Amino acid sequence: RGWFDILDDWLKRDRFVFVGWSGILLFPCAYLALGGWLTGTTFVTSWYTHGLASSYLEGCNFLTVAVSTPANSMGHSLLLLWGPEAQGDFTRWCQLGGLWTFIALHGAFGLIGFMLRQFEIARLVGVRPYNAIAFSAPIAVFVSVFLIYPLGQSSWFFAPSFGVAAIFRFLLFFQGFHNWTLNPFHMMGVAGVLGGALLCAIHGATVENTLFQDGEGASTFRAFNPTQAEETYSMVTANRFWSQIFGIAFSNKRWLHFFMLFVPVTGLWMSAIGVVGLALNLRSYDFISQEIRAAEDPEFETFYTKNLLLNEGIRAWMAPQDQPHENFVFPEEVLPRGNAL
Amino acid sequence: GGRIPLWIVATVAGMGVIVIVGLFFYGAYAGLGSSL
Amino acid sequence: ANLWERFCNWVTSTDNRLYVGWFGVIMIPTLLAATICFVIAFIAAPPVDIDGIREPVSGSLLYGNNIITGAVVPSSNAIGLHFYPIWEAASLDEWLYNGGPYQLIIFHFLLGASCYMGRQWELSYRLGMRPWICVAYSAPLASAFAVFLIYPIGQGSFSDGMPLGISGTFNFMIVFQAEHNILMHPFHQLGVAGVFGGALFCAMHGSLVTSSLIRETTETESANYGYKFGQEEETYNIVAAHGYFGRLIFQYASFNNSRSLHFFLAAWPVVGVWFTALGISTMAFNLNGFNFNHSVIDAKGNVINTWADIINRANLGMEVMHERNAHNFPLDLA
Amino acid sequence: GFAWWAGNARLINLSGKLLGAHVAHAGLIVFWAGAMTLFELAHFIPEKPMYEQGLILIPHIATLGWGVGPGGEVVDTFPFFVVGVVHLISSAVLGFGGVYHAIRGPETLEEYSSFFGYDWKDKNKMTTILGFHLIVLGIGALLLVAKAMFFGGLYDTWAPGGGDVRVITNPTLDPRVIFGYLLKSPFGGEGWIVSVNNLEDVVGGHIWIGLICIAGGIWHILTTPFGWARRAFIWSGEAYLSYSLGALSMMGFIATCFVWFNNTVYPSEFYGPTGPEASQAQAMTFLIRDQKLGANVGSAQGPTGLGKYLMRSPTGEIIFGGETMRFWDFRGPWLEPLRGPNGLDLNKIKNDIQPWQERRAAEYMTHAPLGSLNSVGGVATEINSVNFVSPRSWLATSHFVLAFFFLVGHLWHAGRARAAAAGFEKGIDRESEPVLSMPSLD
Amino acid sequence: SYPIFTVRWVAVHTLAVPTIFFLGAIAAMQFIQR
Amino acid sequence: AELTPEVLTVPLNSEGKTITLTEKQYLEGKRLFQYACASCHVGGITKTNPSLDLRTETLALATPPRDNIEGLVDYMKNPTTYDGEQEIAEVHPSLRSADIFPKMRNLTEKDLVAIAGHILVEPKILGDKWGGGKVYY
Amino acid sequence: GTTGERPFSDIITSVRYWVIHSITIPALFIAGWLFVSTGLAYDVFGTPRPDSYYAQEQRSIPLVTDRFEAKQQVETFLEQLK
Ligand code: CLA
Ligand code: CLA
Ligand code: CLA
Ligand code: CLA
Ligand code: CLA
Ligand SMILES: CC1=C(/C=C/C(C)=C/C=C/C(C)=C/C=C/C=C(C)/C=C/C=C(C)/C=C/C2=C(C)CCCC2(C)C)C(C)(C)CCC1
Ligand SMILES: CC1=C(/C=C/C(C)=C/C=C/C(C)=C/C=C/C=C(C)/C=C/C=C(C)/C=C/C2=C(C)CCCC2(C)C)C(C)(C)CCC1
Ligand SMILES: CC1=C(/C=C/C(C)=C/C=C/C(C)=C/C=C/C=C(C)/C=C/C=C(C)/C=C/C2=C(C)CCCC2(C)C)C(C)(C)CCC1
Ligand SMILES: [Cl-]
Ligand SMILES: [Cl-]
Ligand SMILES: [Fe+2]
């Protein structure tokens, strides 16, 4: 009956927003990460780190605002407010990119707090903790993309900036520099995300079109009671339909719902592994056998060689503006170009 | 209690949203970020 | 006992291991024709002059491709939107050089896939089901129509339809971005929300049902054996699922009606994918993503680049390089 | 017991209120026609081409012959005003009747009168209502024939002299021509009914359609469905709705391709050039430019070995080179003077290109139907400056979208009509589950 | 007997207060000229 | 940086007299340029003849020099080829051809100065971007 | 089905709620406006005004290029606008 148990009582009170011990980590960090992004996208420039405007105050819209990464010259500095770079000056800290690490770091600890919350509530309510386990896939993605990937490169500058169009630029960078679409770990991620969306739609549709008639209304939603013991749709009719339509069907409701967890979670984990390789430029960029043949045989052309020409244009045409610290000067005569264009 | 009818509260709030969003779309054609 | 009535009874029989049906009567030959031609071409077809410039692209395994680089290559830009069946070629050799097989495959496939959707309605009717599973499938089907038929029509050439290949797919989406800025188009943005949200809700629903399975087994058994096919009682506790998820967020952000929950699961990715299919279909007529290039300038009139301008530098790089030999005039107007 | 979000399904069996819904909604259609025209006119500036001004309704009126003269120049905007006002005025009347029948009039009509009342399941009455509307449509098709032959004509982009309003004195009646169009392939170089390239075929087709529709209207008034038709269909309000949803979807897809490819009933003077047209015009432009400099365009070999300006189509016709090789089926009034029996004629190209053709190609090349959602003209990498998206892109995209969703509504309502007719639209009867009485598959 | 200030009260205003503040600042920005 | 009178100061004629535009004139010139010219000359290039641009060094080498208000105002009235040898009013918009180029009809004499002023000012602001094409976007 | 807090729908339809909030909501809106209209937002965050991205005859970006002298580089860039 000491202070610890008294505090435990209060943290675990049933209220509109459950708090819990995990709330002490989750709530401040979630609110600061969110508030950092809203503050920066509304008010803060990227002029000194990127040569870019990036806030509503500067003229940007929702698609173009961003909280951008620090300058390449910062390396992997934590960029703490009180640290040797900003030296406690809030204004300089904003201009040097400090909101980027602020958001990434508080974001990282909020993700941990949210997963602890899933564990905490699951334990108090009496259910198995599979929702927390599935949330490991978003965490793996965040840490590999926002933390591991720039930590293997020269600096934070090459991490994703927190913005709609800034993320689009990240996508296209990865095509032209890493040839990321060719990477089998990304392909496994694509199958997991697309397979998840398919399973989501096909399971939802199946349940809704094998419902039992449990009421007279034309709106079928009213004919369900959360405490009824009876299944609300026919597994038997659903299995027959899919067996005759597609050849196979689910027969076990537990396997089906475990499979729905398994597929997107596994896909995200796979893509995370490939991004860890790209931290080191360990790309699946080429097929060596293709290059040997193509170098010797100028009539040999595939969609593989066509795509590398596209990557080479991306690199040469975006690099000077996208990596301004390198002072790339490419005279017109060195730019790769097809005919006429 | 239930003095102000909720359908009226929703109508007025909804129009307040339309006005602010409309202002933001107007600003895409004037001043900063308009290309002029 | 009449010969036609007995055939009709076999076509629509609910007792065939695989349902045939009247839509199946069109689906089965068209899908077999598309499949057989696809497999043979993927393994063995000679190079195809996709862009009409007498520059053949090698698509098949026997001509130096692997599984990742292989494709059935779209038909020649010289054909445009002209119909090119076998009997219009002077010879199979001509038909192969010019990309005939691509047309045969995609036309038979779009027909058979359309009949696949009809077959889904039809069996649902014979079984006494509700009818709308086929409406969910219309979203992938519309997407296939967009990339194989609609986008060709708008650009004027099946040579700009999507190649039947893994790397050919990547070529298609890189060129699509340089010419339409699809990333900056809201219907593609909604497609991503349809597909990200779909994977999210798949994982959520799977994890919440799995979280609340009623104990029915020992630790030495798969919990899956706690459910028997066709049992009448539910196998999980939706009240416990709701009690957890409502506390994870807040109460009214969680579903306690299983019918509305599963309807939500159906509608979110279906609607998102309808929009992204409409994105491809309307960028077929060159209504492109938002263009904010040089939208921010300073008091003097200097351009102040945003991330949209960096995207444009990337788009420019793809533009100048794609089909590097096909353009003789300064604007790529289709 | 429909929910509020399915609340218009409560009108299925209330013929009086459903009549008001339809008539009120028709007032909305006519209101927008009226209001949009006045908006376009208030913003119209006659010295700018229509397609630089985001106009879609004024081009429809101009095509009927009103307001314009030679070359498509606007001479009098008063016809535009009239069309707008009369539509706007008429919407009040339809609005008035809609709300009366929806709020105050009899909830159901079949008590007030056996003529206006109907049961969806009454196959005789249903085909009678259909027949009346078929006649109305038939009269509608002949109004266009009337305008074309007796009331001033139609704008003709092909008229010698750059286009002009022309009275149609000899509409095409040969059914080999009129129905020949319906049997043309929809693929490239053929184009099904979208290929109609002259006003005589347009007017004659509408004479045929007017007569067919009137004849069909009288047919359906006087008959009831034959037994083979009675066993093949579902006879219910929702089924009829589903059938019309399919027809509207098909029609929207056709309209999409019509505005995208056809430059006869969508004159490029008003709508801007087609995609194929603008791409042909660019090749024309640099052919003209380079030949003025001394280039021999007929013998210039391009990088690939194909001609840089001119090449052969797969069936031999001489055509423009470069990527526009795909668009050689394009036909337009500024280009046809250069065509001989074998395609583009090198001697005409060398000697007979006119300044107006140079102007027209430069105009159409720089007004290709490419633009951003926020109306920045040109390819996606172009900078801001030119505020332009072609009316053809706006009309093609919007109607593809509408056509697609109406196909989905057809599927939705057709499947439901079937299930409601057989009695299982609300779910499976637990005590009588069909699959439970079928043998297992294995 | 309903309380006025709750944990919920704090959560609500923690988000709503700067939201309206930010909306006012963004509105003003639409009238900035270069 | 800002739009100062020095940037708004451009040559009036070949003899070297200068004129200082107002900010109002600059903005009006930009609007009229977009209205009547940008469809072919966006960013100082020429889409239908890329060999000829609106860079000041290009206009200086035209016959009649066109790198000054007078030369440009005259061009908008009676355009010639780059060497001065032929008049091209029938294929290039001009007041002389406002019957066949209707957007030229309602341009007053002061509009012409605003349009010419914009063409001479813009390369001072944008440098290489004016007339550089997509390499500099 | 409730945890003791007052229902939202009861709150926002109540007269007392709207008595307080017809002041607090516009006040916060006005405050945010003045944060921008007084120009204070520029100075707090260091965001360039439309006339202070470049020196008058400059087209080079003032990119930070040192980690530990970065604060002084920004300050030196800014004096080139005074
Ligand atoms: C649970 C809440 C939480 C967590 C985990 C974090 C976590 C973090 N914050 Mg955030 N922050 C929070 C709440 C939180 N913050 C709140 C509530 C505010 C509002 C005030 C902020 C405002 C804020 C700013 C402004 C910044 C951070 C930063 C950081 C990072 C560096 C912090 C550091 O080095 O700690 C150092 C401190 C400790 C590890 C605590 C030490 C406690 C030990 C155990 C006891 C020591 C004994 C003591 C000193 C004895 C004193 C005796 C005395 C008599 C002399 C890190 C990601 C920085 C950042 O993001 O960089 C980009 C940064 O600049 N935070
Ligand atoms: C084109 C759009 C359209 C039209 C014409 C209708 C028409 C109708 N609806 Mg439907 N409905 C629609 C859209 C539409 N609805 C949408 C989008 C929804 C979803 C929110 C619904 C949801 C819905 C429900 C849930 C129900 C209906 C019902 C009805 C019918 C009776 C309504 C009634 O008595 O209201 C009474 C309303 C009033 C007295 C308020 C005043 C409304 C008036 C008409 C406004 C007119 C203003 C206008 C400026 C007047 C001009 C005057 C001048 C021209 C003379 C009526 C035929 C009801 C029905 O079937 O009845 C059995 C019903 O239960 N509708
Ligand atoms: C689809 C349209 C439609 C239909 C089927 C009906 C049907 C009906 N209405 Mg409704 N009504 C409509 C439109 C329609 N109305 C419109 C648009 C208005 C507003 C003006 C009204 C206003 C109205 C009132 C005020 C009343 C009815 C009543 C009635 C009933 C008796 C009508 C009668 O005996 O007329 C007999 C036939 C005639 C009087 C001949 C009319 C000749 C018309 C006006 C000329 C032809 C028009 C032409 C074909 C198209 C318009 C031209 C345009 C394109 C420029 C009947 C159920 C009555 C009712 O329900 O009583 C309880 C009633 O009191 N209606
Ligand atoms: C809005 C127009 C409309 C509508 C909805 C109907 C509706 C109906 N008609 Mg009427 N009909 C109409 C106009 C219309 N008609 C007109 C204008 C005429 C005059 C020519 C007729 C002449 C007519 C006759 C002579 C008969 C009907 C009959 C029928 C019924 C059966 C229809 C059926 O099974 O078709 C389904 C169609 C088929 C089974 C055959 C399809 C053949 C086409 C050509 C397939 C091609 C489709 C293809 C994909 C697209 C390309 C088109 C191609 C021609 C190029 C139904 C109530 C029947 C009935 O019971 O009358 C009492 C009947 O015998 N109609
Ligand atoms: C001629 C056209 C037509 C007609 C008359 C009907 C009529 C009907 N439909 Mg069908 N429907 C159609 C087309 C049509 N539909 C199309 C094209 C689709 C595919 C999308 C559907 C899909 C559909 C579904 C899925 C369902 C119906 C249902 C119904 C019934 C109830 C409708 C209702 O109360 O909605 C009430 C109206 C609303 C709730 C408003 C919807 C709001 C829309 C979606 C947003 C509009 C915004 C717009 C896009 C622009 C945004 C800009 C912004 C400023 C707003 C009624 C019999 C229901 C049914 O089966 O009943 C038997 C039902 O569940 N319809
Ligand atoms: C960073 C930082 C910090 C923090 C801060 C904060 C925490 C902030 C917050 C902030 C916030 C918190 C903000 C907010 C804002 C908001 C907004 C700005 C919103 C908007 C929205 C909108 C616009 C919407 C709209 C709409 C739509 C569009 C549709 C639907 C409807 C609606 C209405 C929803 C501190 C101090 C610690 C210090 C350090 C730094
Ligand atoms: C039933 C219902 C509904 C619906 C309704 C409707 C839809 C209605 C309609 C209505 C209408 C549809 C209306 C209309 C109106 C109109 C009018 C009223 C007009 C007027 C006009 C005028 C007055 C004009 C004037 C002029 C002139 C003459 C000249 C020029 C100028 C001007 C323009 C000014 C709803 C959903 C809501 C709800 C529920 C129920
Ligand atoms: C005006 C014109 C013209 C003409 C046109 C015409 C003459 C047209 C006709 C059209 C027609 C004449 C059409 C038709 C249509 C048809 C249809 C579209 C059909 C449908 C069908 C169906 C839908 C069916 C179904 C079914 C089956 C299959 C099986 C059994 C069941 C049922 C019945 C469901 C021309 C071009 C010269 C020129 C321009 C103008
Ligand atoms: Cl390519
Ligand atoms: Cl070309
Ligand atoms: Fe489920």
Residue numbers in the entry:
A (entry chain D): 12 to 352
B (entry chain J): 5 to 40
C (entry chain A): 11 to 344
D (entry chain C): 32 to 473
E (entry chain F): 12 to 45
F (entry chain V): 1 to 137
G (entry chain E): 3 to 84
Task: Copy text verbatim from the article accompanying this structure deposition.
Importantly, the extra O atom Ox, which was introduced as a bridging ligand between Ca and Mn1 during the S2→S3 transition, disappears or relocates in parallel with Yz reduction starting at approximately 700 μs after the third flash. At 730 μs, the O5, W2 and W3 densities become anisotropic, all pointing toward a region between these three oxygen atoms, which indicates increased mobility of these ligands. At the same time, the Ox density is also highly anisotropic. This movement of all four oxygen atoms is likely related to the formation of the water oxidation intermediate. The change in distance we observe for Yz–D1-H190 between 500 and 730 μs suggests that the reduction of Yzox takes place during this time, through the electron transfer from the OEC to Yz. Thus, the data demonstrate that Yzox reduction by the Mn4CaO5-Ox cluster starts only after around 500 μs 16,21,22 and appears to be complete by the 1,200-μs time point. Consistent with the high mobility observed for the W1 and W2 water ligands, the connection between D1-D170 and Ca appears to be weakened between 730 and 2,000 μs and is only fully restored at the S0 state (3F(200 ms)).
